[model samples]
Target chain A: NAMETPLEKALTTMVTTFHKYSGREGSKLTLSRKELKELIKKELSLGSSIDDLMKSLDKNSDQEIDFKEYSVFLTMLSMAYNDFFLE
Target chain B: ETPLEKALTTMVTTFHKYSGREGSKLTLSRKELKELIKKELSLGEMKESSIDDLMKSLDKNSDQEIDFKEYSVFLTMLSMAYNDFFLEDN
Candidate 1:
């Protein structure tokens, strides 16, 4: 098998990280608010209000983050991190 | 750093590496994006026409440059698409 590229590994890491938390509680395919909180705290190093984040990330208002929603969260978070690089 | 954090950092640093090559350091020119795709991602096989189409799609404001937000969104979608494809094989 060919070696995976860093970007490929990054993508796999992101998806795997989601499942690691998403499967802990509620549906394995989605992240509940509590799961999201843990994910934010552990993965993203966020120590703030997850409620606000949940409200924003739950695009369908289903009170949970699907993979699509999680992708959006990653996009927003990546941009936030990108701001740091700009400075 | 956590795996996710490292991954996020990878995205950010990779963007900067290319975005800084030409015009505004905060954004990526079309050629910069092409170079980035060529070196960093598996999309290197994409033709010039495909790259043009992708550039058009990612340039939300029609500025002809890909900003951090736009690049981030594309990265996220690309990863998700890969995930979907991988899952389909299993």
Candidate 2:
């Protein structure tokens, strides 16, 4: 009944953010180009070309971003943010 | 502005808050990691020995420091644990 701690809320945000975008393309388990583009642009506020990122993250070259791939992306983003904080 | 965006920021900030304690400004010492886990998360009290074991396991580079990559993995582990609990409630 109590509120979740910040850590728990962060985890929820991570998973929900994936579903919020993944479901839009009908897979519910992966993100397509359009889905990823929107997610990065809106959720991440990162406006950039995803072609290179898509190629790098698509470990299986499946033309889609799975949860595992998405998790890696988030990890990279976390590290990037860490570096930004360090600066 | 989004929750996810804010969540990412929180994760990064939390790491730095502990990492800057008494070690490298960019990494967490063993004591710092233990303190962060105890105070930041809702997990019940963790035995110091358990934290010892965790620190050993998480310090993949054996440098006795939890860098950003290692810390990110720790966060991932916590997220997985939380995800499991969430699934069980459904």
Candidate 3:
């Protein structure tokens, strides 16, 4: 039997919050980078530095980030959120 | 032990690759960069208007240039792409 993964739950939480904040229909919220930054800024209280993030994770500096880079980022985010809440 | 783990592992691997590749210096031309942007934006089957909206949206610094910082946030979007779209509700 399959269960809803943690990441899935996280994404759903994200979708819900996105809709709540943007006041946009769930379908209309595509989770763009801009939206994500704003969400993080508002929610996580993190600094908005697209360049720092890219340089930290964009191994190729191709001005484009691939899926590989993104996955690690999500894992870090999950861990960070967990740590923040725990502490 | 679960499908999600597999997916997560794959994402981690991709992240490793992304970071690994960055150690080297490779400059992408304007056209190449635009193509990459287009590919990333297509992930959610974003509406045509939304694509334009995204392009305009990320131009936040108002310098008419989307730098590395601006682009990194896009990674967060990609990371959630498969998990958000495919993971059916239980």
Which of candidates 1 and 3 is the stronger one according to lDDT?
1
Residues A1-87, model 1: lDDT tens digits: 257778778888888888788888888889998898888877877654578888888879998898989988887778777777853
What would the TM-score be for candidate 3 when compared with the true structure?
0.30
DockQ of each: 0.72, 0.70, 0.05
DockQ for candidate 3, please give it.
0.05
TM-score of each: 0.90, 0.88, 0.30
Candidate maximizing TM-score: 1
Error of 1 at B22 (Å): 0.9
Q: How well is candidate 1 docked (DockQ)?
A: 0.72
Q: Per-residue lDDT for B81 in model 3?
A: 66
Order of all candidates by lDDT, from best down to worst? 1, 2, 3
Off by over 4 Å in 1: none
Arrange candidates by DockQ, descending.
1, 2, 3
Give a tens-digit lDDT track for model 2, residues A1-87.
Answer: 357778778888898788788888668778998998889988887754588998889999999998778888999887777777843
List, residue by residue over B5-74, the lDDT tens digit for candidate 2. 8898889888888888896888899989989988888868889889889899899999999988888888
* lDDT, each prediction: 0.84, 0.83, 0.45
Superior by TM-score: candidate 2 or candidate 3: 2
- Candidate 3: segments with Cα more than 4 A from true spot: A1-87, B1-33, B38-51
